[PDB]
Amino acid sequence: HPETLVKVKDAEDQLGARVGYIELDLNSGKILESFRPEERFPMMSTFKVLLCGAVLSRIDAGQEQLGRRIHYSQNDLVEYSPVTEKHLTDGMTVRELCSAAITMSDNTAANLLLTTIGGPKELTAFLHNMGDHVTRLDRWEPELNEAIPNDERDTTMPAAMATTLRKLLTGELLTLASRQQLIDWMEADKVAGPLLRSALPAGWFIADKSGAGERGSRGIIAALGPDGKPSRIVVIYTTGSQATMDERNRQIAEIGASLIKHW
Numbered sequence: 001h002p003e004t005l006v007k008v009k010d011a012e013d014q015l016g017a018r019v020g021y022i023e024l025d026l027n028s029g030k031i032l033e034s035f036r037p038e039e040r041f042p043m044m045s046t047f048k049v050l051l052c053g054a055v056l057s058r059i060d061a062g063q064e065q066l067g068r069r070i071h072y073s074q075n076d077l078v079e080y081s082p083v084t085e086k087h088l089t090d091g092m093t094v095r096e097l098c099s100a101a102i103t104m105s106d107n108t109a110a111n112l113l114l115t116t117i118g119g120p121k122e123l124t125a126f127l128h129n130m131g132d133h134v135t136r137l138d139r140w141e142p143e144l145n146e147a148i149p150n151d152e153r154d155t156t157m158p159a160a161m162a163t164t165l166r167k168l169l170t171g172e173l174l175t176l177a178s179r180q181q182l183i184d185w186m187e188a189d190k191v192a193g194p195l196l197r198s199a200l201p202a203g204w205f206i207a208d209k210s211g212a213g214e215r216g217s218r219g220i221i222a223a224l225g226p227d228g229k230p231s232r233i234v235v236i237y238t239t240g241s242q243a244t245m246d247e248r249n250r251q252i253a254e255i256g257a258s259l260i261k262h263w
């Protein structure tokens with residue numbers, strides 16, 4: 001809606017930074033609203049949904065199992081590993097690692113899952129293979145969050161990320177069971193509370209993944225809709241702001257309130 005576009009531009013003003021925005025119809029793929037849809041932004045922890053999509057694709061092909069147990073050491077742990085830091089002696093299943101990467105944004109869990117598929121360049125190959133020639137991962141946690149201005153490493157465009165999320169959640173790309181598992185992890189997201197979830201009324205469905213990086217980078221990808229079912233994809237990215245985490249949270253929440261109000 002035009003008034004959501006007014007609020008996206010007001011968010012640029014308040015953050016002193018670029019904001020990218022797209023709304024897709026989940027069913028048809030049609031673009032309902034866009035701002036800077038083909039400019040690049042750092043993905044930050046939003047890549048973790050694409051990573052677990054690549055993992056589920058391998059499970060579908062008989063090349064991985066949800067139940068396989070992985071052992072790791074102290075020296076694998078990076079900053080913010082609230083689940084993985086508790087399982088040094090017993091390890092974690094692939095299932096537990098995707099849950100920790102998506103719902104808790106555990107950084108070690110994402111690194112362990114990147115190891116299973118052969119690193120960032122194999123996530124990029126998975127994406128090329130399904131028709132996304134824009135989205136790219138180049139680095140591991142934590143360096144992929146550096147957000148150097150004009151650096152195209154570890155970036156997407158709002159339009160590319162929205163199309164890719166749609167193909168993962170509703171295509172023939174994953175099996176029915178794998179689609180359902182990916183959206184179930186995103187629905188149990190525990191660390192996106194002050195973003196679209198704070199504007200979302202009781203009775204609405206949301207499956208999302210949030211991201212934060214250096215140089216005021218912030219973002220969210222989501223499947224949401226009324227009556228307990230998703231019917232739209234929303235992608236919001238910003239980078240460059242000097243504003244506090246609270247002020248960046250508040251601007252994305254206000255974009256959310258406007259999207260809901262003018263649904």
Ligand SMILES: *C(=O)/C=C/N[C@@H](C(=O)O)[C@](C)(Cn1ccnn1)[SH](=O)=O
Nearest residue numbers: 044045079080107142145211212213
């Ligand atoms: C999700 O988007 C994860 C990004 N990681 C950032 C962040 O959450 O801001 C980390 C945890 C921030 N950080 C760096 C050093 N100390 N904290 S890191 O993984 O870039």
